[PDB]
Amino acid sequence: RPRLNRLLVLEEAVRVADGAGGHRLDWQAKGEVWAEVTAGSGSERAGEFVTLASVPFTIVVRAAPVGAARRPRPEQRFREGARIFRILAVAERDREGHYLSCFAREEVVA
Amino acid sequence: RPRLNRLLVLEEAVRVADGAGGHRLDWQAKGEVWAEVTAGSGSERAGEFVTLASVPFTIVVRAAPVGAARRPRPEQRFREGARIFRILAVAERDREGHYLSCFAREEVVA
Amino acid sequence: RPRLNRLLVLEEAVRVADGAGGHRLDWQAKGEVWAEVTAGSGSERAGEFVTLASVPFTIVVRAAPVGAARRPRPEQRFREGARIFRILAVAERDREGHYLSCFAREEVVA
Amino acid sequence: RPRLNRLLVLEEAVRVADGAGGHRLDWQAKGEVWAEVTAGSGSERAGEFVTLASVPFTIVVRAAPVGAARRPRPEQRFREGARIFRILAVAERDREGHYLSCFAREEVVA
Amino acid sequence: RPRLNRLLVLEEAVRVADGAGGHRLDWQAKGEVWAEVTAGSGSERAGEFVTLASVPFTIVVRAAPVGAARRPRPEQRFREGARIFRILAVAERDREGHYLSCFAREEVVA
Amino acid sequence: RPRLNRLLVLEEAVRVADGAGGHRLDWQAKGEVWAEVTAGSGSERAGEFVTLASVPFTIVVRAAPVGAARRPRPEQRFREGARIFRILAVAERDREGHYLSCFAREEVVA
Amino acid sequence: SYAVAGALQAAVYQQLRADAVLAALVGTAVYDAVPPGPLAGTYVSLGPEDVADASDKTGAGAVHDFVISVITDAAGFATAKAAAAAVSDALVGADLVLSRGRLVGLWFLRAKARRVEKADMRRIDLVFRARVEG
Amino acid sequence: SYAVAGALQAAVYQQLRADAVLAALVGTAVYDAVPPGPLAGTYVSLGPEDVADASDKTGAGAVHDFVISVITDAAGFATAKAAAAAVSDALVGADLVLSRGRLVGLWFLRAKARRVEKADMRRIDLVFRARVEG
Amino acid sequence: SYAVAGALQAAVYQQLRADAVLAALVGTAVYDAVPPGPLAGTYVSLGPEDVADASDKTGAGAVHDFVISVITDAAGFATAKAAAAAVSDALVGADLVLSRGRLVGLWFLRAKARRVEKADMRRIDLVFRARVEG
Amino acid sequence: SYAVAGALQAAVYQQLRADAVLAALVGTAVYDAVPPGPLAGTYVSLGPEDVADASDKTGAGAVHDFVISVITDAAGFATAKAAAAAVSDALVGADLVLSRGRLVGLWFLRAKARRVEKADMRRIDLVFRARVEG
Amino acid sequence: SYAVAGALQAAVYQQLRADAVLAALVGTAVYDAVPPGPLAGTYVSLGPEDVADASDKTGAGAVHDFVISVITDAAGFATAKAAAAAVSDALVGADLVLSRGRLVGLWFLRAKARRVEKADMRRIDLVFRARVEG
Amino acid sequence: SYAVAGALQAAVYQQLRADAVLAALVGTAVYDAVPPGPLAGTYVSLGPEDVADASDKTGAGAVHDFVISVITDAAGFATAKAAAAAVSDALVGADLVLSRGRLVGLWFLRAKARRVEKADMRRIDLVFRARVEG
């Protein structure tokens, strides 16, 4: 079972729509959650015109029912200081449902 | 052997045909089945113009003979509330035939 | 060693040739064999204009010398009722040669 | 260590050259060797206009110095009756050099 | 836990900008760190017009908070003599945060 | 730890330059080293207009400091008689640095 | 698509499955949406259109190079060529009636005919041009 | 892009979601940025433009072959063809007003219509030409 | 395909396996559907057609650029070039009889001839043009 | 490249980051070499040129179809279209001064604008033609 | 292929290995079928033809754009360019004699010359046109 | 290649590394065969030719569109554009002397200039046309 040792700020961006059918993201902070972060094999990735530096980073938080603020959704992101962990999906580790699997990237531009 | 703990609504869509050779899907609910759901490694997937968020989610139900309503077919889907689990195939886990392997995606648009 | 529990109808199609260099397949039934079927990881596959649903299904029959009707050849197929298992190859599991590995697909159109 | 149970005919083709820079192959039989054959995972392969049926088939013969007829070279092939095992490479299994790894395909046209 | 046996010079390049929007790299030496280097499976890689020779080389240094000179960033590189180890990412091995995973290439032109 | 049983001739080619910016290779023999050779999974490879026959062949020699003749560099090759083992990279197996990983191909034209 | 193509597919689907031949060769297996089941194996499929906008000052029209593919799992594919012989004579010189707008002619174009997946399925495309009028 | 295309997308988005039909077929699901949630499944999408610079001595203009795709998860895709029939009549003969510059005409071009991913989604592109003036 | 191509393949298959040469070079190994067994290894194959619709006011015709490939497993491929020398002289200037419609001429076109899979098989395509009449 | 293109990029970089708009939209994030850090996410990038050699008897010139891409991580990409509206008006009708040679005109060309990686980044290329003189 | 190409390769193989130069540069390593062994490493290879059918009313001919590649494992590839200098002067202005039919001329065409696999082998193709007569 | 191209590369290599500039920018790092070592990182490379055979009745010539690429590992690539400015002025208007045959002119052509592998290396190709005479 996980050792939730690291503190991560959950961040949901409120989506103000613009004129052309898109939205605007500002990323205000939601509450702070504790989670363990487990790195996978990391390597460079050909970005757009950047040489990014990605790592898999499976993140384990505690769970919640789906209509609650303590559930990280995949449109959210984590942040430890200035390290932006994205969220790819959440996936319910245990059989009983105590913990979740977040999946990050944390791609600094290298 | 599985611990069937989670409740999932089996859903078969009745297929009303339209004029141009296709069908129309409405997804009325079939009966409720109990099943364990086991997440695989999840990550984002390039959708059509969406950034989807998929997870493998092997789902284990009890079995039935093929001409029965308790068999999930691959044209059906599960639903826990508003979480649409698709069905990719069913594949008969045990040697004796007590349980099945459903395979889901559960791709929220992230 | 395998537990041959499931009954599968071996099917060889007699190949009546047509005018244009091809053949015609009708799939009359050969004898019935007992075999264990072991599912692999199954998922959807982009068909031609179908969304097929395939599973690996390694099938273990008893063996025979190559000039015998009890050898499944890769141009044959199995059938449990209306479930068409194809045969991809046969590959002689044991060191002594008691059992064979058939390989199926069982792709329903989903 | 291997159990050399199956008898395989080693076959070297003598290469009569034709006019246009190529050779002609007839596949006369060399001596018979004993070898164990271990199947890998087999499946269909898109041939040229054939639906072939291949299997990996690592074949273990006894070894020899390189200037001897008992060494299978990759331009040779095995044959158990009418089953053509090709040779992909030979690779010297043991640390002491007692046995070799042949690699076959045995692709029947299915 | 790692056996930090090898001495590696950390190198940060100061980035003097040129006229056309790019930068100029000179790679002055930062401090020396001790680290263990663990090779992965290495093979040739098609370079631009070079036949490079790369190896994975996961490098384990001690950790530091992110605003410190003892943190290797992915824009830095290691150097043992004249062997340039790049840095692909840093990824925080332990649960407590004592050690980091650097990832190198060390591609000599062969 | 390795059992260095096989004798391999290290070969460095002296590079006489020609007029057009290239070099000329003659492959004179350097000293003889003892090494163990461990085959990987071998199969045919589509060459240029050849059907080559390759094997992975990780080769373990004793180590040396980088400015010594006993270090195999990736521009060198091994040769046991007439079997040309290339060198893809060298990668320092042990933690203490007693042994190296050479990586070969040994592609006969089959 | 333009405004007509919603009814163009509904008309070239209804011209099929009323043709007397190919009710005896393919059967009921004429569909855009393939229904779930065991996949019969000699079906035809009518979806991949593309439009080209042959328009004017007064109104608008279109040119639809819609593709009707014939799939077979048979050993040879004189089965599919006999099935698309039944496709094409049902459509060239159509005299169809649409639900929105008119078509003026339904010609024939390219018809590639090759082996698709794993040298097992045999698919023969049929590109038909439909010049319509909105 | 040139200077106009920032307001061209904002005008061809606002011409949609005020068209009366496709508020009853697609609904509110007209967007460039797909909002997070359960992915409704009959949406349209308006992003992939490309410009061609039809300019002159005096000033400048542009030709925008912007793509408006219609996606559906339905079994057939007479649903998408009925939805893009509602797209196209809302835009050809536009008489739009821009925020920066003018457009002189909004025509129609190619409209490919095939099966996209895993033979499950059905996407029908619609290329519209917008000759604008900066 | 158009209506003729069902019988065009049946005629260019029956013109083969009655040609005296290539009954001594390839043998009985002329087939669209490759029969199960050990795969002889010097076969020819007659499936990948494509049609071009050379039609008119009165009736319809077609142009079939059908491909007849020759495969060999031999070391060189002067074996395949000698086999396709036997293919081509059997078909150019055909004077075939069809089952549905007529053909007016069977010419020759491109014939690519390269190494296909793993530099082991040697396949030489032969594109023949058949202008037919329905 | 030819002799001018070393100074052409240095001039079309210095014409940017002195334009008043796009110092308020993109900021300082105009670069060929992306500096290390957290990747701001609304940057532009000026590297992928290609030359075409418009020369003569007396001297030499060139035609540079250099690409200036605008990347954004925003939800929609009316942000990038507003940023490339600020790119293009800064460059068309340039009146730049070079370090080696002259340019005679800086026009505009194709500007593709699609979704790049994982439907998340939005990159809009801008091809500008620079006819220079060495 | 057409009827001549069986003997065209047999003639352009026999014109090689009798040329005095390239018996001193490549050696005996001129082959379609590469013989088993250690792969010498400066060989040439003569297989990938393609035909174009330059025919007439009376008889038939062909245009063979056959490819003769030169492979080298050397560090630079002034070795291959010196070897294909020996290839090309042996064939342009051929005056060959065939076994079936005539050739009227053996010209030269495109000759791509790049780095093939893993930047290690250096292959330089040579396309030669052979207008033959059956 | 034709007979000249063995000496054409030997002449356009010797015209480099005697040019005074690019002995101060690239250094000795002008090579077809990259020598083993640590890979300096601002090298140029002269191998990928292709020939086009501009010949006649009397003799033969050729058109060589040989590619000289400039690679850099620098952050920006105003380093490579300054290096290829030193490449191109050394070759256009060549007045070279060959070992076999003559060249009549060495012009300039396309010069693509993009980011190659992992957005880290920056390679700028330079296609030069060399019309030679054998």
Nearest CA to A27 among J74, J43, H35, J70? J74
- Partners of H64 in beta bridges: H130
Test mutation, K118, K120, K121, K122, chain E, max E CBs within 10 A:
K118
Nearest CA to I60 among I68, I51, I48, I69? I51
G4-133 to CATH, choices 3.30.2000.30, 3.40.1620.10, 1.10.2020.10, 3.90.1300.10:
3.30.2000.30
- Structural domains in chain F plus CATH codes: 6-103 (2.40.10.270)
Tally of residues, chain G: 134
Q: Residue L38: is it exposed, middle or buried by C-beta count within 10 angstroms (0-12/13-18/19+)? A: exposed
Does D50 contact chain G (CB < 8 Å)? yes
Residue carrying structure tokens 């069809």? I98
Burial state string for K97-134 with b = 16 or more CB within 10 A and e = fewer than 16:
ebebbebeebbbeebbbebeeebebbbbbbbbbbbbbb
Nearest CA to E55 among E39, E38, E78, E79? E39
Q: What residue type is I1 in one-letter code?
A: S
The answer to whether G101 and G132 are in contact (CB under 8 A) is yes
CA distance H55 to chain B (A): 32
Q: What share of chain C is helix, strand, coil (3-state, %, to 5)?
A: 0, 45, 55
* CB–CB contact B20 H121 (8 Å): no
Report the distance separating Cα G109 and Cα G129, nearest Å: 7
Q: What residue type is D42 in one-letter code?
A: G
Q: Which residues contact I18 (CB under 8 A, 6 or more apart)?
A: none
Collapsing DSSP states into helix, strand and coil, what is residue L10? helix
**What Å distances lie between residue E32 and F80, F96, K89, CA to CA?**
42, 19, 62
Neighbours of I59 (CB within 10 A): 9
Q: Which two tokens stand for residue D103?
A: 């690699």
The answer to whether A53 and A107 are in contact (CB under 8 A) is yes
Q: How was this structure determined?
A: cryo-EM
Q: Which residues contact I3 (CB under 8 A, 6 or more apart)?
A: G85, G88, G89, I60, I100, I101, I134
Collapsing DSSP states into helix, strand and coil, what is residue H111? strand
**What Å distances lie between residue K18 and K10, K23, K30, K90, CA to CA?**
13, 8, 11, 9
Nearest CA to H96 among H121, H133, H65? H133
Report the distance separating Cα C55 and Cα C44, nearest Å: 9
Q: What are phi and psi of E71, to 5 degrees?
A: -85, 115
Find, in chain E, the residue whose alpha carbon is nearest to that of F102: E42
End-to-end CA distance of chain L: 12
Test mutation, E25, E50, E54, E106, chain L, max L CBs within 10 A:
E50
Write the DSSP string, C12-50. E--EEE-TTS-EEE--EEEEEEEEEEE----EEEE-SSS
Neighbours of J74 (CB within 10 A): 19
Is the pair J, K in contact (3+ CB pairs within 8 Å)? no
Pairing of strands G111-115, G61-67: unpaired
Report the distance separating Cα G50 and Cα H110, nearest Å: 7
The answer to whether G121 and G71 are in contact (CB under 8 A) is yes
The answer to whether A6 and A36 are in contact (CB under 8 A) is yes
Q: Residue D65: is it exposed, middle or buried by C-beta count within 10 angstroms (0-12/13-18/19+)? A: exposed
Q: Residue B55: is it exposed, middle or buried by C-beta count within 10 angstroms (0-12/13-18/19+)? A: buried
Residue F57 gets the label, from left (phi > 0), alpha (psi -120 to 50) or beta, of left
Report the distance separating Cα G70 and Cα G112, nearest Å: 11
Q: Residue H21: is it exposed, middle or buried by C-beta count within 10 angstroms (0-12/13-18/19+)? A: middle
Collapsing DSSP states into helix, strand and coil, what is residue D80? strand
* D chain contacts of residue I116, beta-carbon cutoff 8 Å: 48
* CB–CB contact H14 A19 (8 Å): yes
Neighbours of H13 (CB within 10 A): 22
Nearest CA to G59 among B4, B88, H108, I65? H108
Nearest CA to B27 among B40, B16, B12? B12
Q: Which two tokens stand for residue B63?
A: 């079995």
* CB–CB contact I37 D23 (8 Å): no
Question: In what helix (H) or strand (E) does residue E16 lie, and over which residues does it extend?
Answer: strand E15-17
Taking CA K10 as the corner, what is the angle to CA K4 and CA K13, rounded to the nearest 5 degrees?
135
The answer to whether C32 and C9 are in contact (CB under 8 A) is yes
The answer to whether F76 and F31 are in contact (CB under 8 A) is no
Burial state string for F76-103 with b = 16 or more CB within 10 A and e = fewer than 16:
bbbeeeeebbbbbbbbbbeeeeebbbbb
DSSP F75: T
Q: Which two tokens stand for residue K3?
A: 């009827």
Chains in contact with G, counting 3 or more C-beta pairs less than 8 Å apart as contact: B, C, D, H, I
The answer to whether J126 and J87 are in contact (CB under 8 A) is yes
CA distance C8 to chain B (A): 15
Report the distance separating Cα L14 and Cα L24, nearest Å: 16
**What's the order of all strands across the beta sheet hosting K102-106?**
K61-67, K127-133, K102-106
Q: Which residues contact J20 (CB under 8 A, 6 or more apart)?
A: none
Does B51 contact chain H (CB < 8 Å)? yes
Q: What are phi and psi of A46, to 5 degrees?
A: -65, 110
Question: In what helix (H) or strand (E) does residue E24 lie, and over which residues does it extend?
Answer: strand E23-25
Q: Which two tokens stand for residue L9?
A: 């590369």
Beta strands in H28-116 (DSSP E): 44-45, 49-51, 61-67, 69-72, 102-106, 111-115
Q: What residue type is D77 in one-letter code?
A: R
Beta strands in I9-108 (DSSP E): 44-45, 49-51, 61-67, 69-72, 102-106
Test mutation, I1, I4, I32, chain C, max C CBs within 10 A:
I32
The answer to whether K2 and I111 are in contact (CB under 8 A) is yes
Report the distance separating Cα I82 and Cα I77, nearest Å: 9
Q: Which residues contact C16 (CB under 8 A, 6 or more apart)?
A: C23, C24, C26
Report the distance separating Cα A75 and Cα H33, nearest Å: 12
Report the distance separating Cα B64 and Cα K111, nearest Å: 66
The answer to whether J84 and J71 are in contact (CB under 8 A) is no
- Partners of L130 in beta bridges: L64, L106
Neighbours of I128 (CB within 10 A): 24
**What Å distances lie between residue D37 and D56, D73, D87, D106, CA to CA?**
10, 17, 12, 11
Write the DSSP string, D2-51. ----EEEEEEE--EEE-TTS-EEE--EEEEEEEEEEE----EEEE-SSSE
Residue carrying structure tokens 């199926």? C104
Q: Residue H42: is it exposed, middle or buried by C-beta count within 10 angstroms (0-12/13-18/19+)? A: middle
Q: Which residues contact I85 (CB under 8 A, 6 or more apart)?
A: K1, K2, K3, K4, K5, K6, K100
Report the distance separating Cα K131 and Cα K43, nearest Å: 26
Residues on I contacting D at a C-beta cutoff of 8 Å: 34-39, 45, 47, 69, 71, 74-79, 81, 116-117, 121, 123
Count of CB pairs separated by less than 8 Å, B with J = 14
Report the distance separating Cα C72 and Cα E61, nearest Å: 58
* CB–CB contact G10 B20 (8 Å): yes
Report the distance separating Cα D91 and Cα F105, nearest Å: 11
Report the distance separating Cα C71 and Cα L85, nearest Å: 72
The answer to whether I22 and I38 are in contact (CB under 8 A) is no
CA distance J22 to chain E (A): 15
Q: Residue B83: is it exposed, middle or buried by C-beta count within 10 angstroms (0-12/13-18/19+)? A: middle
CA distance K120 to chain F (A): 11
Q: What is the dihedral of CA E60, E61, E62, E63, to 10 degrees?
A: -90
Report the distance separating Cα H91 and Cα K6, nearest Å: 61
Pairing of strands G122-124, J69-72: unpaired
Q: What is the dihedral of CA D89, D94, D97, D100, to 10 degrees?
A: -30
Report the distance separating Cα H101 and Cα J89, nearest Å: 13
CA distance L74 to chain K (A): 22
Report the distance separating Cα K85 and Cα K87, nearest Å: 5
- Partners of B32 in beta bridges: B9
The answer to whether F48 and K108 are in contact (CB under 8 A) is no
Neighbours of J47 (CB within 10 A): 26
Chains in contact with E, counting 3 or more C-beta pairs less than 8 Å apart as contact: A, F, J, K, L
Q: Which two tokens stand for residue D62?
A: 């006894």
Report the distance separating Cα I1 and Cα G79, nearest Å: 12
User: Which residues, numbered 15 to 74 in chain K, qualify as contacts with chain L under a Cβ-Cβ cut-off of 8 Å?
Assistant: 74
The answer to whether J111 and J44 are in contact (CB under 8 A) is no
- H-state helical runs in chain K: 5-15, 78-88
Report the distance separating Cα H80 and Cα H26, nearest Å: 9
Report the distance separating Cα G52 and Cα G70, nearest Å: 24
Q: Residue E68: is it exposed, middle or buried by C-beta count within 10 angstroms (0-12/13-18/19+)? A: exposed
Tally of residues, chain F: 110
Which value in Å is the resolution of this experimental model?
3.5
Residue L14 gets the label, from left (phi > 0), alpha (psi -120 to 50) or beta, of alpha
* CB–CB contact D103 F39 (8 Å): no
Q: Residue K42: is it exposed, middle or buried by C-beta count within 10 angstroms (0-12/13-18/19+)? A: middle
CA distance B50 to chain J (A): 6
Q: Which two tokens stand for residue E1?
A: 């836990």
- Partners of F43 in beta bridges: F54
Taking CA E71 as the corner, what is the angle to CA E69 and CA E73, rounded to the nearest 5 degrees?
105
The answer to whether B109 and C56 are in contact (CB under 8 A) is no
Collapsing DSSP states into helix, strand and coil, what is residue I130? strand
Test mutation, L34, L70, L125, chain E, max E CBs within 10 A:
L34
Neighbours of J11 (CB within 10 A): 21
Chains in contact with K, counting 3 or more C-beta pairs less than 8 Å apart as contact: D, E, F, I, L
Residue carrying structure tokens 């069908």? B23
Residue carrying structure tokens 């605007």? A24
Report the distance separating Cα A61 and Cα L91, nearest Å: 64
Q: Which two tokens stand for residue J125?
A: 């290329």
Q: Which two tokens stand for residue B79?
A: 């639903």
Does I97 contact chain G (CB < 8 Å)? no
Nearest CA to F8 among F74, F84, F67? F84
Q: Which residues contact K60 (CB under 8 A, 6 or more apart)?
A: I92, I108, K2, K3, K53, K133, K134
Instruction: State the Rg of chain J over Cα.
Output: 15
Report the distance separating Cα I87 and Cα E79, nearest Å: 66
Report the distance separating Cα G94 and Cα G132, nearest Å: 12
Q: What are phi and psi of H86, to 5 degrees?
A: -80, -25
DSSP B108: B
Report the distance separating Cα E96 and Cα E92, nearest Å: 9
Q: What are phi and psi of I126, to 5 degrees?
A: -140, 110
**What Å distances lie between residue L40 and E74, K81, L43, L71, L73, CA to CA?**
21, 27, 7, 10, 9
SS3 letters across chain A: CCCCCEEEEEEECCEEECCCCCEEECCEEEEEEEEEEECCCCEEEECCCCEEEECCCEEEEECCCCCCCCCCCCCCEEEECCEEEECCCCCCCCCCCCEEEEECCCCECC
Report the distance separating Cα H100 and Cα H85, nearest Å: 29
Q: What are phi and psi of L14, to 5 degrees?
A: -75, -20
Neighbours of K95 (CB within 10 A): 8
Nearest CA to I71 among I5, I35, I123? I123
Q: What residue type is D107 in one-letter code?
A: E
Report the distance separating Cα A104 and Cα A58, nearest Å: 6
Nearest CB partner across the interface for K112, out of L10, L50, L60: L50
Q: Which two tokens stand for residue C81?
A: 């009722």
